[PDB]
Design a protein around this ligand. Structure first.
Ligand code: HEM
Ligand code: ZN
Ligand code: ZN
Ligand code: ZN
Ligand code: ZN
Ligand code: ZN
Ligand code: ZN
Ligand code: ZN
Length: 174
């Protein structure tokens, strides 16, 4: 599992960039900035108040659209590097309807699209500009830039990019 995709068949013909743009447009922007944080726009880990096996959040614009990152995600709320998600990211899953996350895993009710085998490490020395911090925080802000750049990294070894279809990426993994 040095990479894999799964997807609702409706997206076979979407480029990765096109699905992510659709996803970001309706997810919106959680607005995780100063003066504006809440219970509502923070997310949560599965397996701890602050560290865990997956981090997940729902859109505060439509209550529904969501993602879940999953690998080995420690955080540092007030710790040495102030407010910076570090660790290990293996998977991103996008879609509608986040449930669970307490004594069960975070699970998406209506999955769209899912990447596994990302192999992306940032250690807590690298702060609020590590890499998993930049991806995840990016996603929390409706900004897929950081995820699309990393994906092109993974995908260009297969002679593809995020501007190729899901069916196409599927073919190149087997
Ligand atoms: C792992 C996912 C998380 C990421 C990537 C993240 C990242 C950030 C970033 C980049 C800021 C910068 C604020 C700014 O400059 O405007 C921030 C603020 C903040 N975050 Fe997080 N955070 C995460 C999880 C959490 C969690 C679980 C909490 C707990 C409720 C939390 C509480 C806060 C607080 C209290 C602030 C500053 C509030 C203020 O000064 O007004 N964060 N976060
Ligand atoms: Zn469908
Ligand atoms: Zn914003
Ligand atoms: Zn959707
Ligand atoms: Zn939808
Ligand atoms: Zn959908
Ligand atoms: Zn950007
Ligand atoms: Zn490469």
């Amino acid at each position: 599992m040095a990479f894999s995709v799964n997807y609702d068949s409706s997206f076979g013909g979407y480029s990765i960039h096109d699905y992510l743009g659709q996803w970001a447009s309706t997810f919106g922007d959680v607005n995780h900035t100063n003066g504006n944080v809440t219970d509502a726009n923070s997310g949560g880990f599965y397996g701890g108040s602050l560290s865990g096996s997956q981090y997940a959040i729902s859109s505060t614009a439509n209550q529904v659209t969501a993602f879940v990152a999953g690998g080995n995600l420690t955080y540092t709320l007030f710790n040495e590097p102030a407010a910076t998600l570090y660790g290990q990211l293996d998977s991103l899953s996008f879609g509608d309807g986040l449930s669970g996350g307490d004594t069960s895993p975070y699970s998406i009710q209506v999955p769209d699209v899912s990447f596994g085998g990302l192999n992306l490490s940032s250690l807590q020395a690298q702060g609020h500009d590590g890499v998993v911090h930049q991806v995840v925080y990016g996603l929390m802000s409706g900004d897929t830039g950081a995820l699309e750049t990393a994906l092109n990294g993974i995908l260009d070894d297969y002679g593809l990019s995020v501007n190729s279809t899901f069916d196409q990426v599927a073919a190149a993994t087997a």
